[PDB]
Structure 1
Amino acid sequence: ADKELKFLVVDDFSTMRRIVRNLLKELGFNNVEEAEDGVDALNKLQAGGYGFVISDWNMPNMDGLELLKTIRADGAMSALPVLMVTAEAKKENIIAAAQAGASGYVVKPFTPATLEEKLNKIFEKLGM
């Protein structure tokens, strides 16, 4: 994918955002911003420019499933890639996320290799 692709990294814990930002850097993507919840994330997205969202699920103010659904229903950003990265691993919840339009799903804790594979699967599926 284009290395200038602008990522939004969403999680309510700095440590988790830090992990994903560093990994993205390793993969050659330095155009990365952070958000600490779904509202913060929507505020940044509507400022424009973003080409990929990586999001946690359990967060205050607006959780990640709501964020995903909000993105998917919004005609301005309905096709924005959204990769869920979350400790949530219950079968019904994994299905709920896919059905809400998740581009991919990663369970914490995850390895660098897993994140890289998940991103590339999405890049390819979407021809990026």
Structure 2
Amino acid sequence: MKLLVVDDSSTMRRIIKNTLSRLGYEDVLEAEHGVEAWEKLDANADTKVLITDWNMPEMNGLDLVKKVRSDSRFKEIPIIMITTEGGKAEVITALKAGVNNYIVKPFTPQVLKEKLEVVLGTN
């Protein structure tokens, strides 16, 4: 149960990561940007779940998700997008690209835990 968490915000990565921990998810890998995310995925096809931000340099999350979905190794990888892009137009955009679950920032650590528990349960 290997998770890859991607976000250009350092404090966001903290919180997500801490929150995964509380849910019993400890095998967490981080990336700052899309390029690094992609690199890590490419080199570790055993990754189970992708959790990605949208807005970031060096390849945004949208481009990342499309790339991932296009790879024949990651056609069924669950993909959760966690983003400030709260408008439905962007939601639709993301679902069409292959995002499976959409969580909108900002959130308290408690709300994040609920919203993630909904998708991931405990581990």
- Which structure is higher in RCO with an 8 Å CA cutoff and minimum separation 6? 2
Q: In structure 2, the residue corresponding to 1:46 is in which secondary structure? A: helix
Partner of 1:51: 48
Indicate conservation of the 8 Å contact 1:55/1:82, yes or no.
Answer: yes
Read off the aligned partner of 1:69 and give its amino acid letter: K
Partner of 1:22: 18
Partner of 1:9: 5
Q: 76, 80, 102: which is aligned to 2:77?
A: 80
1:41 aligns with 2:37: yes
Aligned residues: 121
- In the aligned structure 2, how far is the partner of 1:123 from the partner of 1:41? 20
1:66 aligns with 2:63: yes
Unpaired segments ≥5 residues, structure 1? none
Q: Which runs of 4+ in 1 moved over 3 A?
A: 111-124
Note the C-alpha offset of 1:119.
3.7
Identity %: 49
Partner of 2:103: 106
> Could you say what the CA RMSD is over the residues aligned between the two structures, in angstroms?
1.8
Note the C-alpha offset of 1:103.
1.1
